[PDB]
């Protein structure tokens, strides 16, 4: 393992998610319809943490994460998912190397500063010890030019990866507009995932990435004639979006619609019981000499 | 494995002949929940979780949905909507030793009950009282795991039983584990009873003009009922229409 120290220490950046992060929630074709689904989605216009240099600490993984990268020269290498990441617990390693994509759910002893080096690939300094392998998979690969979006979920024993590749043309930002992420792979791996880390490929390259978090939300998805999702409504973004979901339409006529219910939520738990201290004589029942 | 640290063998991408296991004489308990044991060979599942452990004979009844005790609340909890079969057999001739086989263990204590399919392999001292234990075995501070002293002279309820549980996962995804059924030729433009990778129904199969994405296995109408299916052998998209009906 090698610890890289020649790095400037700046605070994390933040950006606006806009309408990104919508994915196909299931494997069923439907077309020319509006479908209401309750699932883990990236909320619209959410605060997305933005990282650049060689900026890649371990981040929390809660219900799931949204990951996006803007690159021009293939710097991204992969991800580490796990609970402790130090061979004490099971961990998931996803690496896209020069020739293919490898997924391994072996028990890895990770480095405290993992990375790859490169133009041809040479260095691989991700882990040392690796035994107790449980799952392996290999497959086809995957201003700035390339935008890559991924959704990572860990539900009911499956780790679901969704992805979209698009062109980009901004120097320093995330595009506005709508696209849907198709599912890439469903891995049947029952891993407790609470933390993750990004693998990047001395000098620094030109690349940036964004990390958002999924929440339980209801989305109204618009399927076109060819069954492609072309729009969506986040049913809790604003009162209009809620109205659109309630009427199951993306067009709302003039009028007044009853769309929800307001309720004040409790902030404290008040527990009151009699101030008695004597214990019940259960022991005397159980340990009696004669029954 | 010990029940506190039970083994799971994920089973996928294969043909599952369940008639061999069900019609075997070597098994004493074979209880299925959510499916019937005689229809298993006609079904397809996305994934099968083969879970295996050794328990005491009296505890065999605890390997069921909705049960309470030490093995259920602390070693191998099953969900109430469990689909699968709990196959179990007496293994006294394999697991017993004269002085007692102390390799098989179970968790006796825990702060809270185990959620479904939650393995717990810690050995942290259990605090029974209000006084912190700080890692030291003593009064109100117990060792959470205990061994079964399996001896050949023990009664039937205390003999070792090996348990294999088979969890059948059913989510809207491609099925990978199917029974030993023979496939037939595809017939189109006629009313037939069809079974497409576990999906069953009656209708007329026609060639579809729908542009299915590479990951989509079937389709649904505005009504949220199945109206198209991808054939499991040739990746052809078929439309399913109901067989002609109407009032008389």
């Amino acid at each position, epitope marked *: 393992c090698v610890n890289l120290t020649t790095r400037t220490q700046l605070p994390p950046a933040y950006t606006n998610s806009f309408t990104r992060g919508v994915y196909y929630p299931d494997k069923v074709f439907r077309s020319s319809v509006l479908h209401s689904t309750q699932d883990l989605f990236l909320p619209f216009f959410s605060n997305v943490t933005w990282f650049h240099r060689f900026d890649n600490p371990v981040l929390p993984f809660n219900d799931g994460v949204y990951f996006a990268s803007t690159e021009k020269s293939n710097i991204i290498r992969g991800w580490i998912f796990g609970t402790t990441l130090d061979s004490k617990t099971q961990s998931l390693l996803i690496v896209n190397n020069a020739t293919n994509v490898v997924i391994k759910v072996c028990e890895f002893q990770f480095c405290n500063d993992p990375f790859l080096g490169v133009c041809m690939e040479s260095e691989f300094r991700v882990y040392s010890s690796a035994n107790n392998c449980t799952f392996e998979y290999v497959s086809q690969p995957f201003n700035f030019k390339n935008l890559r979006e991924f959704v990572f979920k860990n539900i009911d024993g499956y780790f679901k990866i969704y992805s979209k590749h698009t062109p980009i043309n901004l120097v320093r930002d995330l595009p506005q507009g709508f696209s849907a992420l198709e599912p890439l792979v469903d891995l049947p791996i029952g891993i407790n995932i609470t933390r993750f880390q990004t693998l990047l490929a001395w000098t620094a390259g030109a690349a940036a990435y964004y990390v958002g978090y999924l929440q339980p939300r209801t989305f109204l998805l618009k399927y076109n004639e060819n069954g492609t999702i072309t729009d969506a409504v986040d049913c809790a973004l604003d009162p209009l979006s809620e109205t659109k979901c309630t009427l199951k339409s993306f067009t709302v006529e003039k009028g007044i619609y009853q769309t929800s219910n307001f309720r004040v939520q409790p902030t404290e738990s008040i527990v009151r019981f009699p101030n008695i201290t004597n214990l019940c004589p259960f022991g005397e029942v159980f340990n009696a000499t004669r029954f | 494995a010990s029940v506190y640290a039970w083994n799971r063998k994920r089973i996928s991408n294969c043909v599952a002949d369940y008639s061999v296991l069900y019609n075997s004489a070597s098994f004493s308990t074979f209880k299925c929940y959510g499916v019937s044991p005689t229809k298993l060979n006609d079904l397809c599942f996305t994934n099968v979780y083969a879970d295996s452990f050794v328990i005491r004979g009296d505890e065999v009844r605890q390997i069921a949905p909705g049960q309470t005790g030490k093995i259920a609340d602390y070693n191998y909890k099953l969900p109430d909507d469990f689909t699968g079969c709990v196959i179990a057999w007496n293994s006294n001739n394999l697991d017993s030793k004269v002085g007692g086989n102390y390799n098989y263990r179970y968790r006796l204590f825990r702060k809270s009950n185990l959620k479904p399919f939650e393995r717990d392999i810690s050995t942290e001292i259990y605090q029974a009282g209000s006084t912190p234990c700080n890692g030291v*075995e003593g009064f109100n501070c117990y060792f959470p795991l205990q061994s079964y002293g399996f001896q050949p002279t023990n009664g039937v309820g205390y003999q070792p039983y090996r348990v294999v549980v088979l969890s059948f996962e059913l989510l809207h995804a491609p099925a990978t584990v199917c029974g030993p059924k023979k496939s037939t030729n595809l017939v189109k433009n006629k009313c037939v009873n069809f079974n497409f990778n576990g999906l069953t129904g009656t209708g007329v199969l026609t060639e579809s003009n729908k542009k299915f994405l590479p990951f989509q296995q079937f389709g649904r109408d505005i009504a949220d009922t199945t109206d198209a299916v991808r054939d499991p052998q040739t990746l052809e998209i078929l439309d399913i229409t109901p067989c002609s009906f109407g009032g008389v």
Partner: antibody
Amino acid sequence: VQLVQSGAEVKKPGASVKVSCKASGYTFTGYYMHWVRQAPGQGLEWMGWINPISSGTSYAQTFQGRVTMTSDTSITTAYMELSRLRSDDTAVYYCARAAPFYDFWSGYSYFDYWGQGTLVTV
Amino acid sequence: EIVMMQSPGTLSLSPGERATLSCRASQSVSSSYLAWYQQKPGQAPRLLIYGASSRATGIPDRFSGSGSGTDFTLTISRLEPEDFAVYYCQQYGSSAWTFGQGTKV
């Protein structure tokens, strides 16, 4: 329930002695093994205990730092190792079976089965 | 620590009579932690009474116990030649097991 101990041993001062206790007729790891010392003409003195499931121990303050207790579940046998012997340690050593501390009834407060004593002369 | 004192140090009586032995403690003792043992000469001790008054399995009804607080007693209704042995009281407290000095019968 039977507990069978090794034969008598004679040791010089400063030496160490190991006394075995083989258990049968019950689940070995389900009970604590205690050791009790009886000097000739004297009463019984508790030395400590071993929990076979975890190889946990506790020792009396009198013998803390001098005695090690171990067990081997495979052969259902407990062992005593008493180091730094002095002439005052000549005694009959008994192994005793007691319930673990989690017994709802106070089964850990008393010894229900005893093995035959092992005489150690120093 | 707690001092365990038995009385009388030596008992002398004839077969067929009743005997009472006493055990005193420095500090109050829960009834659940008091036990009596019989040790015959040349033999290992064996349990007679546990939980202050409960007879151990296999023990004749001639043996009984009673007591509370710091004062416990063991009574033998009728003695046989096998009963002329050493009797001990034992107590658990703190994280230790304490035995008395023993009484000879």
